[PDB]
Amino acid sequence: MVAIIFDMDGVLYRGNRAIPGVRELIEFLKERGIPFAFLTNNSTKTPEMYREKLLKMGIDVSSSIIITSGLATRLYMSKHLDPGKIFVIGGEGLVKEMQALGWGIVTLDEARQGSWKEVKHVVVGLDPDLTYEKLKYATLAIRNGATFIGTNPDATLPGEEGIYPGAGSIIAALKVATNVEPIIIGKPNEPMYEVVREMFPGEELWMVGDRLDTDIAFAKKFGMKAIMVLTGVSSLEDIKKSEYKPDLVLPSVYELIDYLKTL
Amino acid sequence: MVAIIFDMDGVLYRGNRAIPGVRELIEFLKERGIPFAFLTNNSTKTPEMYREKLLKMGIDVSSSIIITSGLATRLYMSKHLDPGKIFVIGGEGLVKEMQALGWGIVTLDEARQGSWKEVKHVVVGLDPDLTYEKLKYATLAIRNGATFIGTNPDATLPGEEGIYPGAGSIIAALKVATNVEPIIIGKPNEPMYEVVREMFPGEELWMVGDRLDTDIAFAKKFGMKAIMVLTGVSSLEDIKKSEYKPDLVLPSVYELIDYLK
Lengths: 263, 261
Ligand SMILES: [Mg+2]
Ligand SMILES: [Mg+2]
Fold this sequence. Notes:
Two copies of one chain form a homodimer.
Chain A: E1 2-6, E2 13-14, E3 17-18, H1 22-31, E4 36-40, H2 47-56, E5 66-68, H3 69-80, E6 86-89, H4 92-101, H5 108-112, E7 121-124, H6 132-143, E8 147-150, E9 156-159, E10 162-165, H7 167-178, E11 183-184, H8 190-199, E12 204-209, H9 212-221, E13 225-229, H10 236-240, E14 248-250, H11 256-261
Parallel strand pairs in A: 1-4, 1-12, 4-5, 6-7, 7-8, 8-11, 12-13, 13-14
Antiparallel strand pairs in A: 2-3, 9-10
The complex binds magnesium ion (MG) (2 copies).
One magnesium ion binds next to loops of chain A.
């Protein structure tokens, strides 16, 4: 009873470009009864927002099978930490997930008044509007004993003008400023796997991605079939100089159909 | 003869107050014509600004002997790099030093037009007004071949409310985003030593500092007499596990007077 987990950007679509055959694949998985879920390290957007983006790319799926690092972070906090006030560095998606916890968020303004002193958890995701001030209060809070949580490790992600700094870039700065080892939630980390597992309890899991350092590393560390597609960031060549080795390489997710039909 | 190089914070003063005996010492060095300079890894301030801070404490010196990491960065660039436009992440101090190079600075507005591609050198120091946008263009430029230069390795520095992120933390974010090893100027790195060395040709150098991991490491790596004072960050106990060891430990810079006679 196989369940397939798909990374999004570079797998189900590429930027603002649709990848041919994705709708067919998804229509096929439903026909075969094959459960699936989308898993993105990006924490700037909600599952709902992602459902809309997917629709625009010719894909219709429930936001219920869309797992973002932000939602994984909320689930991790709820299950393994003690409720306390949160200071957030990140976008709308992440703020919304933290608000949902209902633990209470210390705003930048309250922080300026000294409330960083009462922060129990610091959550860091990709923040396009990052400022030194934010790094300052996050550092003060983490140094005061606040949990240091990072949504994902990605050093970078594509931007309009080229390769832009990712959450890992921001998390790295705080690691240096606090001298504290962050708890990273997303791929290729265990908290993310815990979330996938919770959704699909006893299934044989397959991971389909385009990044070796996150997607493939994730599959190998947790025993998921490591399937890499070539529609994204990685190439056959990157495989060799990488510690992570795909169990299967396909041109795109469309080819998953005949792969599944021929066993 | 002998030239004395002093780290500043934790040696000549603490935050806002001069350490006792520092005024006598400085006046003593001047009377004897003993060469000396002040060295700081901070690049947010101009040497002139430091002079004023020191004078208000009764510490009277020339701005020409106050070497900031920004000043050291300029001298390293002129000496070892080929002239090219610069993109700067840092405060007034560093911006001013980069201007003095006369190589041309790409501002955020120019970078917004796409001029980040014309950046030949990216210089990164402590920037209290850091923004993701700045990190973005610095990242793009470095990925486009621009030199990745960091003013100092300092992970943190003292702030009003506690320990704040230092230049090293900003440099770390860019190292991760670019996958490029930054060339670090400030102590214990060699570029800052090269600057001091060239300032006092023919002089035996003594380095006076309060940090084992930066000042003492700096002295031992480049052959300066490593003098540690106890008025700052490091303590005697810290020496045990420290990689580099001081040649001499003094309670403060004041106890230095008898040695010079
Ligand atoms: Mg991807
Ligand atoms: Mg010091």
